Amino acid sequence: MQELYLLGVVPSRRFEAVVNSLSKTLDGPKTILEFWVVYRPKPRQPDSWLRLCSNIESHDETDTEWSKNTQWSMYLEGNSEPKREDKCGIRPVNRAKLTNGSVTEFVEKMGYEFSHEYIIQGLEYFFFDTTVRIYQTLIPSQQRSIKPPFHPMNEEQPWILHVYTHVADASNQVAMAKAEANLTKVKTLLSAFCDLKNVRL
């Protein structure tokens, strides 16, 4: 799967105004609250690390063992393509959703070990067949815990603006072109309040 995207940063002081602008020009938003745990094979190559995502927006913070009562999406994110400066970014992204018992332990059995984990807090909008997410990456107050509070990595942490769309087949030239065209439309639509550009991933 191919992910075409644009990235931008929104200072904490402008958050309110940018969100209202996004609500005035786009469809949405829907809240985003995800728990991510990353596993690496047991120069390191992170594009081969397993990135597990659980939607904690649908959990009881009181649930002592939420990780076993959840569905995890498993991702493999490659490095974005180079020489695409001044153009939208592109990177390979593969996904598979897995359940049954404790996925965490299953991936360790496959030969992987825990690397790091974090929480994503934000809003998600939609327009021109693309998704625009504005979020902050947080740190659990206790490893593998969904019980607040969650701490920012820095007190003057900006919000990240990530605009993207997915194309199933990289070979489909028409689909790829329609996606870049859609990103371009969203870019100018948000250019009045946020600079979006290709950033390496």
Partner: peptide, 23 residues
């Protein structure tokens, strides 16, 4: 500076590397 934060935050999510700026 917010652009430096972006780079460090993106790096952390990607490789778990925590820059000094991200305490």
């Amino acid at each position: 500076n917010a652009n430096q934060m972006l780079t460090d935050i993106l790096s952390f999510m990607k490789s778990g590397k925590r820059a000094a700026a991200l305490e």
